[PDB]
């Protein structure tokens, strides 16, 4: 799974089977990292109109 974003701590109580999370657009919003099993929230990098 490829993408760009900021990886932050999360408070989403994932169930043991659950690995990642998806928004309405189906883009991944949270992921469970391998090796360490922690749950990292994925927040898109800052953008906006100039």
């Amino acid at each position: 799974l490829t993408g760009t974003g900021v990886l932050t701590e999360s408070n989403k109580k994932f169930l043991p089977f659950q690995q990642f999370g998806r928004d309405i657009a189906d883009t991944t919003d949270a992921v469970r990292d391998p090796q360490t099993l922690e749950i990292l929230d994925i927040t898109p990098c800052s953008f906006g109109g100039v």
Binding site: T4, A25, T27, F47, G48, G49
Partner: protein, 220 residues
Amino acid sequence: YTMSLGAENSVAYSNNSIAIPTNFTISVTTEILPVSMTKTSVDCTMYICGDSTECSNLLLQYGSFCTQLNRALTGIAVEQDKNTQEVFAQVKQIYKTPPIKDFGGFNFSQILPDPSKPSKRSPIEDLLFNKVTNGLTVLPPLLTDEMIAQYTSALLAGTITSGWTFGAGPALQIPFPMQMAYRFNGIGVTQNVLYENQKLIANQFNSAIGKIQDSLSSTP
């Protein structure tokens, strides 16, 4: 069922009989009109492609579609602010009500701004605001809600303290019963009818305003 069009009323027409009203009701009715929408802007390149350089390179083969869509959305966004200016910003003077609310029995507390509220809105406006609930951005409106409320407050102060004079030029003060008598003459009723029944008219107006607030608070 087959819907009824109305209650059936037969008018008692004859060639020499007329019906004359002996009383009146001061009726306050609500009319809700939308003014603006949410100002939405969509980054066409980011919506179609995101951060992919190859996708944008392929998107440049289609030309200036993205420029057209951004220009149209920008036109809509400025049109919403123009609509709000046209509706609410029709006075260049911010009129204020006097501290003493002596209007000859007429009560405007439900439509004048409440000093106790930090938003400086009327109780009716506060109830109205309570009852309404990937490259996309929402632009804030140029006029905030407190400034729109301030414009409505200025319009209310002008129409209460000056009648229709502030809309045609300088604001000329007039007592509110006298202004109501002028409005009575506008609809073809003599001034005496307003003056003789001034307490009754003020009571009916206050009751109708309270019924408006109750009807808004009781209807989803």
